[PDB]
Amino acid sequence: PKQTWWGDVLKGNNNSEAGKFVPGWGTTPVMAGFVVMITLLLLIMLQVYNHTIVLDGVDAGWTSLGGF
Amino acid sequence: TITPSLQGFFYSILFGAIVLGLLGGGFIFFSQKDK
Amino acid sequence: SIRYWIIHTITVPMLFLAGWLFVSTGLAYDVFGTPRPNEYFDQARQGLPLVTDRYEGKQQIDEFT
Amino acid sequence: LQLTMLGAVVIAGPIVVLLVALR
Amino acid sequence: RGWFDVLDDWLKRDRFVFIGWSGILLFPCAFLSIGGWFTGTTFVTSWYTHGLASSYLEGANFLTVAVSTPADSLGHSLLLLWGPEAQGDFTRWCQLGGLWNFTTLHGVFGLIGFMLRQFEIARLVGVRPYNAVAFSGPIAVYVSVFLMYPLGQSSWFFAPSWGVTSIFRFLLFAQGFHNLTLNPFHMMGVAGILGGALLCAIHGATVENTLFEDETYSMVTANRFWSQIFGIAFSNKRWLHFFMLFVPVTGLWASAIGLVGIALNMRAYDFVSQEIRAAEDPEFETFYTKNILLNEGLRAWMAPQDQIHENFIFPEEVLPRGN
Amino acid sequence: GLPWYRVHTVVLNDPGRLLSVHLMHTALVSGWAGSMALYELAKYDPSDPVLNPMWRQGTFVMPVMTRIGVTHSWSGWTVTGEPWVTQPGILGAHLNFFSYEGVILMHILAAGLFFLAAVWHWINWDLDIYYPDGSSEPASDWPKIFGLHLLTLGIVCFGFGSLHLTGILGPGMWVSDPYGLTGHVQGVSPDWRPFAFDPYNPTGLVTHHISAGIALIIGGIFHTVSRPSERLYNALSMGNVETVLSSSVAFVAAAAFVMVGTMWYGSATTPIELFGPTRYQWDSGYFQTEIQRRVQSGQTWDQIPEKLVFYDYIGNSPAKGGLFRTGAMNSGDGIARAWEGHPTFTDSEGRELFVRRMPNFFETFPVVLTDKDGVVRADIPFRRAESRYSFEQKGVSVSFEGGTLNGQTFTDAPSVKKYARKAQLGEPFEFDRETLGSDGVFRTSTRGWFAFSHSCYALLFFFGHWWHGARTIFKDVFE
Amino acid sequence: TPNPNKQPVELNRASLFIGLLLVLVLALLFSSYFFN
Amino acid sequence: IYTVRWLAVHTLGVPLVWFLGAIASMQFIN
Amino acid sequence: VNDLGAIATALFVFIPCVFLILLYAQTASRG
Amino acid sequence: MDVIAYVFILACIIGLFFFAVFFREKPT
Amino acid sequence: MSVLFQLLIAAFVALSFAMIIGVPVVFSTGDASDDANKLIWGGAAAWVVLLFVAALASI
Numbered sequence A: 001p002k003q004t005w006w007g008d009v010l011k012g013n014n015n016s017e018a019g020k021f022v023p024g025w026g027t028t029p030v031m032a033g034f035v036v037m038i039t040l041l042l043l044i045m046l047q048v049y050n051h052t053i054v055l056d057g058v059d060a061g062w063t064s065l066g067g068f
Numbered sequence B: 001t002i003t004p005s006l007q008g009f010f011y012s013i014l015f016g017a018i019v020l021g022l023l024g025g026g027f028i029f030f031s032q033k034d035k
Numbered sequence C: 001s002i003r004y005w006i007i008h009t010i011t012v013p014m015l016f017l018a019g020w021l022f023v024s025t026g027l028a029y030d031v032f033g034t035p036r037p038n039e040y041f042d043q044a045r046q047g048l049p050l051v052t053d054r055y056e057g058k059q060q061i062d063e064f065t
Numbered sequence D: 001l002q003l004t005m006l007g008a009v010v011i012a013g014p015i016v017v018l019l020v021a022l023r
Numbered sequence E: 001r002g003w004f005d006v007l008d009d010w011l012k013r014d015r016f017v018f019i020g021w022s023g024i025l026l027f028p029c030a031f032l033s034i035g036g037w038f039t040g041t042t043f044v045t046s047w048y049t050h051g052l053a054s055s056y057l058e059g060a061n062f063l064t065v066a067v068s069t070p071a072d073s074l075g076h077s078l079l080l081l082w083g084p085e086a087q088g089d090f091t092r093w094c095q096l097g098g099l100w101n102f103t104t105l106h107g108v109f110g111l112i113g114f115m116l117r118q119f120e121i122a123r124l125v126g127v128r129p130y131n132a133v134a135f136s137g138p139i140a141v142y143v144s145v146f147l148m149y150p151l152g153q154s155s156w157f158f159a160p161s162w163g164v165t166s167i168f169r170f171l172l173f174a175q176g177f178h179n180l181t182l183n184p185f186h187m188m189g190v191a192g193i194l195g196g197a198l199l200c201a202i203h204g205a206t207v208e209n210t211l212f213e214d215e216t217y218s219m220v221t222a223n224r225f226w227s228q229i230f231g232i233a234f235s236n237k238r239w240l241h242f243f244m245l246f247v248p249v250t251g252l253w254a255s256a257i258g259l260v261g262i263a264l265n266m267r268a269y270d271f272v273s274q275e276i277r278a279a280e281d282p283e284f285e286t287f288y289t290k291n292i293l294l295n296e297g298l299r300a301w302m303a304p305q306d307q308i309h310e311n312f313i314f315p316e317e318v319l320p321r322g323n
Numbered sequence F: 001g002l003p004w005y006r007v008h009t010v011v012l013n014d015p016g017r018l019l020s021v022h023l024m025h026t027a028l029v030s031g032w033a034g035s036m037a038l039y040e041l042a043k044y045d046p047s048d049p050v051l052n053p054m055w056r057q058g059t060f061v062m063p064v065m066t067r068i069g070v071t072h073s074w075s076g077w078t079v080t081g082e083p084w085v086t087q088p089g090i091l092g093a094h095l096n097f098f099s100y101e102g103v104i105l106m107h108i109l110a111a112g113l114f115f116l117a118a119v120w121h122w123i124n125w126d127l128d129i130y131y132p133d134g135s136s137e138p139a140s141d142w143p144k145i146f147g148l149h150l151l152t153l154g155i156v157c158f159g160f161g162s163l164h165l166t167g168i169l170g171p172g173m174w175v176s177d178p179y180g181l182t183g184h185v186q187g188v189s190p191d192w193r194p195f196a197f198d199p200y201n202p203t204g205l206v207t208h209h210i211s212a213g214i215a216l217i218i219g220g221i222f223h224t225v226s227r228p229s230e231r232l233y234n235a236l237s238m239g240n241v242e243t244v245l246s247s248s249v250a251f252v253a254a255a256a257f258v259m260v261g262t263m264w265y266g267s268a269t270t271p272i273e274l275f276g277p278t279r280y281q282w283d284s285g286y287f288q289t290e291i292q293r294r295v296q297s298g299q300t301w302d303q304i305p306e307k308l309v310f311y312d313y314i315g316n317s318p319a320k321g322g323l324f325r326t327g328a329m330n331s332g333d334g335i336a337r338a339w340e341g342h343p344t345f346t347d348s349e350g351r352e353l354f355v356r357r358m359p360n361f362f363e364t365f366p367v368v369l370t371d372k373d374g375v376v377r378a379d380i381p382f383r384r385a386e387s388r389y390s391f392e393q394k395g396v397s398v399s400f401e402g403g404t405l406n407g408q409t410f411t412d413a414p415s416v417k418k419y420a421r422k423a424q425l426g427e428p429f430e431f432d433r434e435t436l437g438s439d440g441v442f443r444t445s446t447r448g449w450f451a452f453s454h455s456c457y458a459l460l461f462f463f464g465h466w467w468h469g470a471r472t473i474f475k476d477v478f479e
Numbered sequence G: 001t002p003n004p005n006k007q008p009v010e011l012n013r014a015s016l017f018i019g020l021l022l023v024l025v026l027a028l029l030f031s032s033y034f035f036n
Numbered sequence H: 001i002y003t004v005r006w007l008a009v010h011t012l013g014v015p016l017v018w019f020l021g022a023i024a025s026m027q028f029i030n
Numbered sequence I: 001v002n003d004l005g006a007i008a009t010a011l012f013v014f015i016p017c018v019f020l021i022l023l024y025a026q027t028a029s030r031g
Numbered sequence J: 001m002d003v004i005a006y007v008f009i010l011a012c013i014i015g016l017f018f019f020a021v022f023f024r025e026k027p028t
Numbered sequence K: 001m002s003v004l005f006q007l008l009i010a011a012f013v014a015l016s017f018a019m020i021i022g023v024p025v026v027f028s029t030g031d032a033s034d035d036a037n038k039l040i041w042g043g044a045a046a047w048v049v050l051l052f053v054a055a056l057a058s059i
């Protein structure tokens, strides 16, 4: 159990609050919303990549490279 | 500007919300009924 | 037992006939776009109605229709 | 063709009798 | 006890069948996939995508009905009922082949729900979930064949149409164009499946024929019998049953890797030295060369009608024959 | 003792040795990067950037390097077609150092340093930090460690997006024209208008790495402070590192699948100048359409830029290779040297017919010269058969526009047949096999190898995710 | 200071034969393609 | 009386019966 | 054929084989 | 020379069979 | 909405027949009155509502 200097610096981040949790649900409800949000985001991207969704003036193909 | 495809996707979100809401509502309501 | 027998006797043949008439009255062909036996070809329209474009497929079928 | 509905009514009547007849 | 605990206990309650949380994903998706297949076979035809009569209304047989794949022009469009293709018109959605996408996607989510269900049941009973790991193989096959393969190709049109004769067409197409039988991964898959059947058969027979006259069978007699008849035998029961589990699953995974390889035309189609040596002299003839010739013939005789969208026109002169 | 498939569990309860094996793995990965780049440099031909680009040459890591800035070599040559000019003059112009060899040197140095750190941490496995204040059992808090790591990665992502990609303080990124003609390494400017979601427009990438970068930083900060919830903490067993393994393996498999999708379908990240053309540009006639329109636009045939015609060869498609056809593509059809010019075929009556091009699927195709109106005019009958629509019986001349065979007219039946087969193979070309002993059978480009290998990897890592999720959830049983 | 977590590695004879069979059979299957 | 099993049984049987009737009807089509 | 075909086959045959033999030997030496 | 590779692998397999049959550790 | 109208009338016939069978048994024998009375009066109410709905659904 060497008491190095860097260990002194980092031990608080390592295991100061090890094994601690808040009871109940806590922030879990909020997390739910975030997941749903990204579940739309990714979905939209997929369809945009899939050409299911066609955004206005956004030609999902090699033609969009025009301008470089 | 909205295009027909994007509007279709928005209607999809509406229908999917409705389906999930009806399924979850049925499940939770029936679970609450015979507590 | 006995009670449900009344309901099932009243209902099940009605459902059977519902499907029967759905086919017999020709409604299925309209619902599902399935051609009538004479609709596969006209007297000489022996070409096949194959879709060639992704974007306007429904309209192209309407032309094929 | 029309014997189906007539038979349905013939079933309907005595069935209404019988359901009371059970009690 | 919040609403969530009530819901959880309600799901886990004993019934005729066990629902669990997994049921919320499995049952609707499985039911929709099955219903989509039944509808597609019963009413919807493929007259516009493949130019076929693959429905009962058309007058097809049970061995010839099929939920045929979408057209080739659509590429890999997801074909949502409200997408740019269908645009909310149910009839056009059916004619374009959207039922194939409906069935396949809901099948994917049904398989996922089933694996989750096995996880949940094993968690409730309190035993190792080897069943879920076993089921991982069928999911690999399904994802490799119905999703990754048509995604690596030009369109959904090249996926296996849900049917019987359509699946047979898929098998013959794969042999003709990818020469699948020569793929080593398919060989490992075949060995796995046939070995799994062999293991089931001999394990059942052995357990029946070493029964004690009352686990319940003479492991010692079975071990000695197989050692002196075949040479080798399982002296451990746990190893015996884990091997029974392990062999077919491994076969399925090897075949899955073989199928993903051919999805990119990364196929073992030929042996270079054989092609060179056949080019040098025409007398050199082996079974592999004649297999190559059969592949040429199947490609030529099937392409004009299988891929009707391409408008292939090969005259009688160019069609390979045994002259 | 342990079974051979569990030998590495001896570091499960030891944070120090677990970190040590991670560092050793990092050293191996960085060493492989360096060595592979070194090998590719040692087997490269910078002379021909047009008819022998890097993707034709079996390069694997060079396109990945070139994607985000590294183009030249200390020996001088650039991949863009010009000897490198030492435009660097000042600090912040390390660009003369970070060539291919500079990157190789840095990666080998990192490999060595990580190996030394791994040895150190293996020896000093019992540092005090791994142990809590008053319990002999080592115990780490995974949620806060995740927060710290996420914050670090968010900082690095924001820096990459805003400084390197924009070109403000970095080389920028590779951009090109829709036809893979001009390839620059230039900065990009981020735009939050919806067209930044177009996967083929590079302005999205920057816009992503900025915004997503910030999203991670916030996501880092929250997790560096916020504690988990009893409900989730007990459900996911956040005290057990195996759950982290399960979730990470699932994430990495998903990443592999998404990368394979982009590689196979093409995007702004994968430009055809680097990784080669996709398999859909051949199917949709993308380059043939473009060329035909350009010539039809009044330009003569000889004035067509040779990259645009090389892309129209079917030997460039990644869907024409094989699983065990090894090596660079030039080991296959051989290395190209010259474009014979666009050929045109005429029959006895003088009608102009065309050869149908072989699709990606067919390993061999039947040569069929058809009238533009859809009527088959002539063909090459099967290996030995008697015909009525034939090559000789009808007679066919071929005339070449541009290229090596300019103005020429071969009416010799073997010559017409050879060039008919070439025409059905895309554009006729001068290919050399004597240099490499090439086998004439094709091979797949870099793009195909990426797609295949990482689709296999993703498929396997999904099973890995399932197994490790099972061993996490069922921990009390798996013992 | 010794590490408690060290454990030996075991592989009995039967496992050796199984592994050698797997390796040799895989080599025989894949050599015909490696030589191409 | 609307048990989950009632729902399941009906969700299966109703379309099943309808489709059986439809197929029977197709059998008598010339 | 591939000049590296024989080398690949040999290394495939050998490396897992020597690994397995080493494990079995250092198992059997131990009691 | 491929023939030598094939024959060597096959001979190794046969030797493995011989040892696996007549030299297995006794089950107990 | 024509097909909707036909389906509505078919449901009306179904309900009407169900009431035809149920009403004499419910009314004559009030042994199961707790649920039977609710059944019969709810059937009557549904009958009235369906008729009123079809009244407009005709046009």
Ligand code: CL7
Pocket: A027, A028, A029, A030, A031, A034, A038, A039, A040, A042, A043, A046, F143, F146, F150, F215, F216, F218, F219, F220, F222, F223, F226, F227, F228, F229, F232, F236
């Ligand atoms: C600060 C705002 C925010 C950000 C930006 C953020 N988090 Mg969180 N976040 C986590 C990861 C994370 C990562 C990896 C990450 C960056 O990539 C972030 N976060 C980022 C987990 C460690 C932790 C909870 C882990 C946890 O339980 O996550 C949910 C569980 C699972 C199984 C994930 C669901 C995955 C599905 C299987 C995917 C299936 C795919 C499908 C087949 C097809 C897709 C189709 C597509 C097109 C749509 C977490 C939390 C949590 C919160 C909260 C409130 C947040 N966060 C918030 C954030 C918890 O309650 C909660 C917490 O307890 O905080 C301590």
Ligand code: CL7
Pocket: F004, F005, F006, F007, F008, F009, F245, F249, F460, F461, F462, F463, F464, F465, F467, F471
């Ligand atoms: C193949 C499916 C799979 C995946 C992809 C996977 N694992 Mg495991 N896995 C572990 C880590 C791991 C990590 C860090 C990781 C992702 O990075 C993975 N895994 C991923 C260890 C914690 C734990 C013990 C590890 C352990 O004991 O490993 C011992 C393995 C040895 C001596 C050699 C195995 C031979 C391989 C052919 C190696 C070939 C070289 C390599 C391929 C080069 C390519 C690099 C890269 C591209 C792949 C573990 C297990 C184990 C298993 C099993 C069956 C798996 N896995 C399976 C997977 C244990 O029994 C076992 C277990 O937990 O039982 C208790």
Ligand SMILES: C=Cc1c(C)c2cc3nc(c4c5[nH]c(cc6nc(cc1[nH]2)C(C)=C6CC)c(C)c5C(=O)[C@@H]4C(=O)OC)[C@H](CCC(=O)OC/C=C(/C)CCC[C@H](C)CCC[C@H](C)CCCC(C)C)[C@@H]3C
Pocket: E029, E030, E033, E034, E037, E103, E106, E107, E108, E109, E110, E111, E114, E131, E134, E135, E137, E138, E162, E163, E164, E193, E248, E249, E252
């Ligand atoms: C054709 C081959 C084949 C079939 C039909 C099949 C069938 C099944 N295997 C199951 C299980 C398993 N299979 C296992 C290993 C294997 N399974 C194999 C091969 C098969 N397994 C092989 C080779 C192995 C050895 C590795 C295991 C280890 C299990 C199980 O644990 C599990 C079980 O418990 O079985 C009793 C399923 C349990 C119910 C379920 O979840 O359905 C599938 C669920 C859904 C949601 C189906 C959705 C719809 C599908 C995906 C598409 C539509 C299909 C149409 C409705 C019909 C198509 C008709 C055709 C002619 C096209 C089901 C009975």
Ligand SMILES: CCCCCCCCCCCCCCCC(=O)OC[C@H](COP(=O)(O)OC[C@@H](O)CO)OC(=O)CCCCCCCCCCCCCCC
Pocket: E191, E239, F002, F003, F004, F005, G010, G011, G012, G014, G015, G016, G018, G019, G020, G021, G022, G023, G025, I015, I016, I019
């Ligand atoms: C980067 C460098 C990489 C170098 C290469 C590394 C190679 C690592 C070793 C690979 C091979 C491992 C083999 C272990 C072999 C071994 O010891 O197996 C027996 C072993 C027994 O497990 P137990 O826990 O009971 O005992 C473990 C100990 O005996 C050994 O640790 O079980 C498994 O390994 C499970 C998987 C079996 C897999 C084989 C099943 C099929 C056998 C027959 C198949 C071939 C014949 C087909 C005929 C058609």
Ligand code: HEM
Pocket: C003, C004, C007, C008, C011, C012, C015, H001, H005, H006, H009, H010, H013, H014, H017
């Ligand atoms: C649309 C027509 C149908 C109606 C209106 C209907 C109505 C009902 C009703 C009211 C019950 C409860 C019976 C009671 O407890 O008194 C019931 C139960 C049942 N029905 Fe139906 N039914 C119909 C069609 C079917 C079909 C097609 C089947 C399958 C062949 C079926 C099988 C059953 C079974 C098995 C039960 C008993 C379920 C249980 O008690 O667990 N029914 N049905």
Ligand SMILES: CC1=CCCC(C)(C)[C@H]1/C=C/C(C)=C/C=C/C(C)=C/C=C/C=C(C)/C=C/C=C(C)/C=C/C1=C(C)CCCC1(C)C
Pocket: E031, E032, E034, E035, E036, E037, E038, E039, E102, H012, H015, H016, H017, H019, H020
């Ligand atoms: C079993 C067998 C072996 C021995 C001999 C024997 C003759 C007995 C033989 C039996 C043969 C017979 C007659 C089998 C009859 C089978 C049939 C047709 C079962 C069918 C049930 C029908 C079902 C589920 C349909 C469900 C349809 C659904 C959800 C529709 C889903 C929908 C889709 C598809 C489009 C969008 C809208 C919506 C509503 C979401």
Ligand SMILES: CC1=CCCC(C)(C)[C@H]1/C=C/C(C)=C/C=C/C(C)=C/C=C/C=C(C)/C=C/C=C(C)/C=C\C1=C(C)CCCC1(C)C
Pocket: F027, F028, F029, F031, F032, F035, F108, F109, F111, F112, F113, F115, F116
């Ligand atoms: C030690 C020292 C300290 C101070 C600084 C200094 C620079 C001097 C430093 C020296 C550092 C040096 C020279 C480091 C070199 C590191 C090297 C070359 C590491 C190794 C990289 C090689 C790797 C990963 C191996 C990959 C092999 C694999 C996957 C196995 C099988 C393969 C796979 C599964 C894919 C297909 C191909 C093949 C072969 C079948």
